[PDB]
Amino acid sequence: GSLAPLNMKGLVKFQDVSFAYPNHPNVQVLQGLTFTLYPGKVTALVGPNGSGKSTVAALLQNLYQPTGGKVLLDGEPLVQYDHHYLHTQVAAVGQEPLLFGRSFRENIAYGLTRTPTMEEITAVAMESGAHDFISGFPQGYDTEVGETGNQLSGGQRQAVALARALIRKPRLLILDNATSALAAGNQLRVQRLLYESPEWASRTVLLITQQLSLAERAHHILFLKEGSVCEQGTHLQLMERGGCYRSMVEALAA
Amino acid sequence: GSLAPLNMKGLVKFQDVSFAYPNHPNVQVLQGLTFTLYPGKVTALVGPNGSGKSTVAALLQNLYQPTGGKVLLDGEPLVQYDHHYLHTQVAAVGQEPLLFGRSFRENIAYGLTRTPTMEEITAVAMESGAHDFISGFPQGYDTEVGETGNQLSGGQRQAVALARALIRKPRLLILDNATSALAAGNQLRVQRLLYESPEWASRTVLLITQQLSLAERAHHILFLKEGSVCEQGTHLQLMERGGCYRSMVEALAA
Ligand SMILES: Nc1ncnc2c1ncn2[C@@H]1O[C@H](COP(=O)(O)OP(=O)(O)OP(=O)(O)O)[C@@H](O)[C@H]1O
Ligand SMILES: Nc1ncnc2c1ncn2[C@@H]1O[C@H](COP(=O)(O)OP(=O)(O)OP(=O)(O)O)[C@@H](O)[C@H]1O
Ligand SMILES: [Mg+2]
Ligand SMILES: [Mg+2]
Ligand code: NI
């Protein structure tokens, strides 16, 4: 990879993408996968378990390469880009959020290519709803995260993991079930941050969630079944269709 | 990956490692690959073309995972470590050294997790022998690298690529033919930096070279043939053996 463009729109395109994990070569996780993630819009990726949603997120971070087809970022293949440049443009928060044993300010800074001020760290923690519980500590942001493995709450962990990606100011934000542990209060904080903010109105967001309520408000929804796009479009468009998306939502609480 | 130990010795172990590129599943590039990279020692990896030397370097950066066996860093599997933590501990320079279109000081800083001073940037460039030609520019270190693709010399590119990894201060330095373009003058600069320096006397170095002259002075030599360790040991030990290493060196200029 050589590409490090100073201006990235954030357009993501999957073109006939097929993938199988290198340890399971012929078990097609993805097959003929085609969609487009538009910059400034939040696209929700939903579907049944084992469909390939997290696999899609892995391919977007160039953790794996597609066996067939192309994963395109701003027109060029993802492999053409510099690895560390991708880290500066693409950030992903997950329901697989592993802290360290270091201070909270070190956990938030993470792989940042600079030294962030306290005003900067407090800001992203406030937007992620992690500032309050951190400020309650005697050592504050210098408090080393517990090596206990459960020294912290579920949502309080995700709040730290969220702020970690916010401070990166990525062009592409991938949320892999990183909203499940958050309460509706902190949920709205994220939603308003992604929807009702001028900062995140220029960036593309991939919201992977099992919570159809969150996908309901998304600008675009990708329904994934058997490793392929079963349906596509907004909530209303998918609703009147009365197919995969609708049937899945049909069985819910009104 | 969760591991981010504040103290890393740098011990690298390959244990019965077998690998095949995910696009070519049953073409065994590596098979029963076992060796140990000792901290504070420079280990040279040599062998015929297509043996798997660069593949080994790829596995060490966790770019790929072994289909069989284990790649161990300081006792724990490489996948157990945090991805961005690995970037802070493991740095690799290659004969595949792609610059950008940004300033020389930005190319050297690269993926650094902080903001480096000019004293710091000049130091690594001086040690890599890149300070002189950069200082000759009117804009100095702020000179944007040419988008021409050949605006710079071969060795002058490698000198910049070398300093990029030096400033990272990695526990594991991987040199994938990153010495071929350097003259014997700049060669000695690297050699003295790796051998005759207190800074690099505590770190492990993997020197991948086709230049047997460089491997001759290494603390340890790994001969790779058909994806496996044919022979092992220092220069003299491999010499008296009179096998793979010796025979390859037997045909040379005395
Ligand atoms: N590391 C891996 N190695 C091999 N196979 C895997 C790996 N990770 C996932 N798979 C397989 O790939 C399929 C897709 O998994 P993926 O995690 O993308 O599904 P998902 O849509 O995230 O599921 P859920 O909706 O339950 O989170 C799964 O059936 C799983 O068995
Ligand atoms: N990206 C790739 N995809 C598929 N196969 C590959 C890839 N890279 C290398 N190979 C194959 O793996 C084998 C090992 O390649 P590798 O680059 O490790 O050899 P090497 O020891 O670096 O060779 P040389 O000494 O000529 O540099 C080669 O025969 C090559 O055909
Ligand atoms: Mg999953
Ligand atoms: Mg090679
Ligand atoms: Ni990386």
Numbering used by the authors:
A (entry chain A), B (entry chain A): 469 to 722
Please share excerpts from the published article on this structure:
Life depends on transport systems that shuttle ions and molecules across cell membranes. Interestingly, the two composite ATP-binding sites are functionally non-equivalent. Membrane transport via alternating access can occur either uni- or bidirectionally.
yielding two copies of the D-loop mutation in the homodimeric state. polarization-based competition assay showed that the affinities for ATP and ADP of isolated wt and D-loop (D651A) mutant rat TAP1-NBD are similar. the crystal structure of Walker B/D-loop double mutant rat TAP1-NBD. form the canonical NBD sandwich interface. asymmetric unit, reveals two significant differences. re-organization, the C-terminal regions slide with respect to each other. key interactions for the D-loop aspartate. γ-phosphate, backbone of A649 and A651, and N654 side chain. overall D-loop and Walker A positions are essentially unaffected. flexibility of the D-loop destabilize the NBD dimer and precludes ATP hydrolysis.
